[PDB]
Amino acid sequence: GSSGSSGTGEKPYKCEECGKGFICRRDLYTHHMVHTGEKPSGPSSG
């Protein structure tokens, strides 16, 4: 779907939660931690 053409470099593993690119699949997962702790109780208001 999304536009995909040869040009700029894109990380092989990107967070599907926020959209952070990483050169290592391991690192990405680690960051996923901050995602497993949502805060539905705050001004977040979505």
Complex with Zn ion: residue 7 or 40, whichever CB lies closer = 40
> What are 21's strand-pairing partners?
14
Binding marks (x or -) toward Zn ion, 13..32, rule CB under 5 A? --x-xx-x------------
Smallest separation (angstroms) from Zn ion to the CB of 17 = 4
Residue 9 is encoded by which pair of tokens?
A: 């470099």
Count of residues of this chain found to bind Zn ion when the rule CB under 5 A is applied: 4
> What is d(CA 45, CA 31) in angstroms, rounded to the nearest whole number?
23
- For residue 43, the tally of other CB atoms under 10 A from its CB is 5
Catalog residues that contact Zn ion under the rule CB under 5 A.
Answer: 15, 17-18, 20
